[PDB]
Design a binder for these strands. Structure first.
Ligand SMILES: Nc1nc2c(ncn2[C@@H]2O[C@H](COP(=O)(O)OP(=O)(O)O)[C@@H](O)[C@H]2O)c(=O)[nH]1
Ligand SMILES: Nc1nc2c(ncn2[C@@H]2O[C@H](COP(=O)(O)OP(=O)(O)O)[C@@H](O)[C@H]2O)c(=O)[nH]1
Ligand code: ALF
Ligand code: ALF
Ligand SMILES: [Mg+2]
Ligand SMILES: [Mg+2]
Lengths: 271, 293
RNA sequence: UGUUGGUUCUCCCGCAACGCGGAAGCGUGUGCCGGGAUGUAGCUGGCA
């Protein structure tokens, strides 16, 4: 049965779940399998799924944007993970549920960021509030939020510039963006969404940690699950921070965003 | 963590006799754990471990002072060996224009890297550089390159999303030959190894311009999946080099080993920031010490 | 258009933070939406 210890250990590790989380899940699995005296494979697969299901059941809360004017979502995370693409997706979704959406082009740093967002705005036939690269991000987003109140907009999604979490000064910048929002709405940002590239390994932990400490994360989006990457690191992060997983990215077209469903995620992870 | 763990295993199993395979057991498992938390893809960890085993059998160890330190010296030496050599360069001495093709997954840092290479090549190798984008997929990608190009004082060959990448690069090469340019940098859209049509596309682009360099660009925070991508890309194109981007982050960077192993190709550059000046040469020992902490 | 609040660029300065550097110092997608000068200037928001 040692070849089985070796085998499942390998399966967990190749999916980027991490060693600590691997020990937790496997240790609980030895106790569960020995306990219920399981003799067949399919039942083992079942129990594994059940326990992982426990971890993900604390983070399955879907996002609700109803009830505020506007409901403010703040997109944060590291570079090139797909924050902007995800916003593009989010808009078509919200427009599908009869919500008027506005976009803030808060990435005022990276080359062509604003034009990129604007393409998502034209694709969504919704307004995009922007100044230029070089502008103050915080003030761009603030102006956006004021404009959304004025125009009775239902959801305002603010893009930020991707930043690495060890760059403390960029995190301070992030904090200003939030702080400055508070002057219009104390409970905004109503959703602070971390975006994690599914290719990412254990550094995601650090990411989730530092952004959290900076800003208080209220949701996660897992992108690029349309490849071979399973994105298992999320278990570790769920274990440590309990952040709701809102959506999954599954491609680059405007329709390639799916509400996060734990069971589908389990399905994908194994095949 | 490293020195102290290795010192623990080495004082506790063996006393003061030479190191023999039965002393090595705990050492090997723990090194494996360290490398896994460092995001080194598993198979690569096994293969490195075996070499470590081989260096462990005939150890000349009982003589140095700290057992952890000598064993560490050997792991470090092995790793620095694995990583390659210094002063690894782009072939700019052959017939001009030197065509450089970028390849890799979405958001890896390819466009940013093209800008960085434009800066490096014009400023330091006194090169006359043309850059082009074949990214007709990601919105505003071309304008992103055009911007970067205008910023680094290099010429930009216009393309639009209504064109086809093969047409674009053929045109670009034609212009570079015709106007006696020293270098053609070719930016492409991020693509997944499972994307059959896009891999066909990159294979065809490479076939069209016969590039002297094909650079595989890889996000340094990449976890296990790097084993897959590397393999696919290595098998899809003749890679001549690797760019590892976002090393200015705090990720341990183990993907570098993984990739380096599976492709056997040299890492030529580190991307070390978002700005165009942020480019560094690859030093095996520095990255090695980073991965081991 | 009318009025105000942002911001950018140009000039001026303060406090602090971060990065690099024996240090002196050089910086700044950092903070105090710091303080001023200025444009006939831009870009952005609110309200009549
Ligand atoms: N294959 C795939 N690509 C994605 C996904 N999400 C984003 N991308 C691509 O990732 C690249 C970078 O994403 P972007 O939104 O510009 O990153 P940002 O810097 O975080 O805003 C873009 O080329 C996107 O098309 C996804 O779910 N699957
Ligand atoms: N911090 C950091 N960011 C980088 C680096 N290289 C690229 N990026 C960022 O990653 C994001 C995606 O870059 P991009 O060049 O468009 O990726 P591409 O889709 O492969 O062209 C942008 O925010 C870049 O600024 C790097 O070395 N360090
Ligand atoms: F390219 Al980014 F946030 F990393 F727009
Ligand atoms: F988003 Al890319 F190359 F992956 F521009
Ligand atoms: Mg973006
Ligand atoms: Mg690009």
């Amino acid at each position: 049965d040692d070849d089985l210890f070796e085998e499942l250990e390998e399966q967990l590790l190749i999916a980027d779940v991490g060693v600590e989380t691997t020990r937790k899940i496997i240790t609980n699995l030895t106790e569960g399998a020995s306990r219920k005296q399981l003799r067949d494979a399919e039942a083992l697969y079942g129990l594994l799924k059940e326990e992982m299901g426990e971890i993900l059941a604390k983070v399955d809360e879907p996002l609700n944007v109803e009830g505020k004017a506007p409901f403010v979502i703040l997109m944060v995370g590291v570079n090139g993970v797909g924050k902007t693409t995800t916003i593009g997706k989010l808009a078509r979704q919200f427009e599908q549920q009869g919500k008027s959406v506005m976009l803030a082009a808060g990435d005022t740093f990276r080359a062509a960021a604003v034009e990129q967002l604007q393409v998502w705005g034209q694709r969504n036939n919704i307004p995009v509030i922007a100044q230029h690269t070089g502008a103050d991000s915080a003030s761009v987003i603030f102006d956006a939020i004021q404009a959304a109140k004025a125009r009775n907009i239902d959801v305002l999604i603010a893009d930020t510039a991707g930043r690495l979490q060890n760059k403390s000064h960029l995190m301070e910048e992030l904090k200003k963006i939030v702080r400055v929002m508070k002057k219009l709405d104390v409970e905004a940002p109503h959703e602070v969404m971390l975006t994690i590239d599914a290719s990412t390994g254990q550094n995601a932990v650090s990411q989730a940690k530092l952004f959290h400490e900076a800003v208080g994360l209220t949701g996660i989006t897992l992108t690029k699950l349309d490849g071979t990457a399973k994105g298992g690191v999320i278990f570790s992060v769920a274990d440590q921070f309990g952040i709701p997983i809102r959506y999954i990215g599954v491609g680059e077209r405007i329709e390639d965003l799916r509400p996060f469903k734990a069971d589908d995620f389990i399905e994908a992870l194994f095949a | 963590n490293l020195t102290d763990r290795l010192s623990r295993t080495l004082r506790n199993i063996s006393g003061r006799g030479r190191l023999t395979e039965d002393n090595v057991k705990d050492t090997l498992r723990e090194v494996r754990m360290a490398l896994l938390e460092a995001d080194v893809a598993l198979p690569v960890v096994r293969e490195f471990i075996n070499r470590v085993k081989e260096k462990a059998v005939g150890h000349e160890v009982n003589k140095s002072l700290t057992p952890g330190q000598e064993f560490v010296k050997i792991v470090r030496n092995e790793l620095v060996a694995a990583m390659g050599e210094e002063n690894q360069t782009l072939n700019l001495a052959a017939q001009p224009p030197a065509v450089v093709l970028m390849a890799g997954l979405q958001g890896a840092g390819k466009t940013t890297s093209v800008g960085k290479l434009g800066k490096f090549l014009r400023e330091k190798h006194k090169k006359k550089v043309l850059v082009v984008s074949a990214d007709v997929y990601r919105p505003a990608a071309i304008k992103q390159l055009e911007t970067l190009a205008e910023q680094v004082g290099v010429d930009f060959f216009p393309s639009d999303v209504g064109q086809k990448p093969v047409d674009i690069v053929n045109a670009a090469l034609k212009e570079a030959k015709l106007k006696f340019y020293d270098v053609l940098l070719v930016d492409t859209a991020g693509r997944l190894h499972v994307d059959e049509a896009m891999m066909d596309e990159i294979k065809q682009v490479h076939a069209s311009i016969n590039p002297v360099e094909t650079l595989f660009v890889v996000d340094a925070m990449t976890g296990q999946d790097a084993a897959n991508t590397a393999k696919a890309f290595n098998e899809a194109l003749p890679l001549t080099g690797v760019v590892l981007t976002k090393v200015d982050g705090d990720a341990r960077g183990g993907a570098a080993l993984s990739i380096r192993h599976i492709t056997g190709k040299p890492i030529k550059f580190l991307g070390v920031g978002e700005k165009t000046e942020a480019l560094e040469p690859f030093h095996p020992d520095r990255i090695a010490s980073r991965i081991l902490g």
